[PDB]
Design an enzyme around this catalytic site. Structure first.
Site, PDB file in Angstrom:
ATOM      1  N   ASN A  98       0.813  -1.231   0.000  1.00  0.00           N
ATOM      2  CA  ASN A  98       0.000   0.000   0.000  1.00  0.00           C
ATOM      3  C   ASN A  98       0.847   1.283   0.000  1.00  0.00           C
ATOM      4  OD1 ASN A  98      -1.170  -1.887   2.625  1.00  0.00           O
ATOM      5  ND2 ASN A  98      -2.505  -1.741   0.826  1.00  0.00           N
TER       6      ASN A  98
ATOM      7  N   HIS B 138       2.968   2.261   2.260  1.00  0.00           N
ATOM      8  CA  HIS B 138       3.158   2.763   3.618  1.00  0.00           C
ATOM      9  C   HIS B 138       4.432   2.160   4.205  1.00  0.00           C
ATOM     10  CE1 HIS B 138      -0.748   4.617   3.931  1.00  0.00           C
ATOM     11  NE2 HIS B 138      -1.283   3.549   3.339  1.00  0.00           N
TER      12      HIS B 138
ATOM     13  N   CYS C  13       5.075   7.445   9.405  1.00  0.00           N
ATOM     14  CA  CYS C  13       6.174   8.149   8.752  1.00  0.00           C
ATOM     15  C   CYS C  13       5.888   8.012   7.248  1.00  0.00           C
ATOM     16  CB  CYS C  13       7.520   7.530   9.136  1.00  0.00           C
ATOM     17  SG  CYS C  13       8.951   8.136   8.184  1.00  0.00           S
TER      18      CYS C  13
END
Ligand SMILES: CNC[C@@H]1COc2ccccc2O1
Ligand SMILES: CNC[C@@H]1COc2ccccc2O1
Lengths: 268, 269
Positions: A190, A192, A227
């Site tokens: 995804n 991330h 983050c």
């Protein structure tokens, strides 16, 4: 891997790989954290949940709801050696409207002895606005049929390390690793940052001498903020003591907190 | 995994893991490079060589000699999906006194079709001084009994991409990723930076749009110098070209000392 006889837990065996071991010929804590995440994904697949790392139900999909890690707690007694087989058993339990819990037990496949254990707290949030919310009845009814009803805790002890409150590190930090950036290998499907990268980032501020003379026994990590791919992280460590450390991950610029944690190390 | 019937090659099956896949739900090139390295290490173990990544022998160990990668060439036709089983076959061949070659064939375990192939050139080097040397007869006799005697090439073609000369990128670079540092997860058991990290570092200067619209077909990487744990790297890329070609350069952030040079070929999805 496969669900156990009652279908209320999942087991999987892994042979430790050459590139998965550290300077002691044994699996690193990040290899362990990766294997727990892999067996957790396989358990979600085996019972019809999404596999993108969010364990999403058909109800959560329409409402743009995802499961996110709020805390990870890992205790290792013996790190498997390269070539060794480790068996991991994992299960989930509902914690009412607070969220969900995933627990793990790590064993030596040959001896059958418990070589480690882990616990994690997950919370429900909107994927777009990032707003946390309590678990509704409609979504509980969908995942409770895959959880044991009676409590089954990997860390049962009253007053154990997994539920301890973590303080915020005070400036100046004793140790630090500045300018940490994620690369594409640090990202999931995804796009991330993988939860395991934060563990590596936390351990980067621990001096090499501690790593060389000690073994990591316990790690507790709170996840406050994600983050982004273009964010830069600073890793801060202070000795609070066996050796104990207090940790803090914050954005390099504004000093925005992303993680806080603690580690416990034993002499070899 | 296990050595084949004749004991002259090694095979292993791998199921693709959740954390090993990229934005396309398929294995990344770094996951592929990691699996080739794992099957190579298992082949060295199965025939009595050292397992630290150097495939040593008692003779090399006496003289402080190690095998080091000089070139890596990977060509992928289909990246396995998460949950798929990939079977990798690997073998070694002597290249006279120049050094050794390790080749790989990647197949879909279900269909049996070749989904990728790789080749690598290794050279003999003193561990301490870092000096290269031609393979001696005493060393050749120790590993030749584990290699097929007739040539067996993963890239047999006469003017193929695996043996092409790579030029040095000229400043200014079109693209760049500056300040790259290895962490402990990037190190092997001997505390050296893993060869796979350099592949990731090379790909960091490729723009995200290229990654999002194209698939990596070929990667050729020359290894000139090792990156220390406390070194900082700059990754530089320039478009040299449906297909996109890039010229790459890894150099130390400070002095500009070259550590790697390479090329990539991408095709439209
Ligand atoms: C975030 N982990 C819990 C969710 C919901 O309950 C689950 C039950 C069984 C397998 C996966 C599960 O995923
Ligand atoms: C640098 N790789 C080649 C060396 C020597 O020949 C070998 C033959 C079989 C397995 C491993 C081998 O390791």
């Amino acid at each position: 891997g496969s669900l156990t006889e009652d279908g209320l837990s999942y087991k999987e065996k892994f042979v430790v790989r050459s590139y998965e071991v550290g300077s002691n010929k044994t699996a690193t804590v990040e290899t362990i954290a990766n294997l727990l995440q892999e067996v957790g994904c396989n358990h979600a697949q085996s019972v019809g949940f999404s596999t993108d790392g969010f364990a999403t139900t058909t109800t959560m999909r329409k409402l743009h709801l995802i499961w996110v890690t709020a805390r990870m707690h890992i205790e290792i007694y013996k790190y498997p050696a390269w070539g060794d087989v480790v068996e991991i058993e994992t299960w989930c339990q509902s914690e009412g409207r607070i969220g969900t819990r995933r627990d793990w037990i790590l064993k030596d496949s040959v001896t059958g002895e418990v070589t480690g254990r882990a616990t994690s707290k997950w919370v429900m949030m909107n994927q777009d606005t990032r707003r946390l919310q309590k678990v509704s009845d409609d979504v509980r009814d969908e995942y409770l049929v895959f959880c044991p009803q009676e409590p089954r805790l990997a860390f049962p002890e009253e007053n154990n390390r997994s539920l301890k409150k973590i303080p915020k590190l005070e400036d100046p930090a004793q140790y630090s690793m500045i300018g940490l950036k994620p690369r594409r290998a640090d990202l999931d499907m995804n796009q991330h940052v993988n939860n395991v990268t934060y563990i590596g980032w936390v351990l980067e501020s621990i001096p090499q001498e501690i790593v060389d003379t000690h073994e990591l026994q316990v790690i507790t990590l709170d996840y406050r903020r994600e983050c982004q791919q273009d964010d830069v992280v600073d890793s801060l460590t202070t000795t609070t003591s066996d050796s104990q450390f207090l940790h803090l991950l914050r954005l390099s610029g504004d000093g925005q907190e992303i993680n806080r944690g603690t580690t416990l190390w034993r002499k070899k």
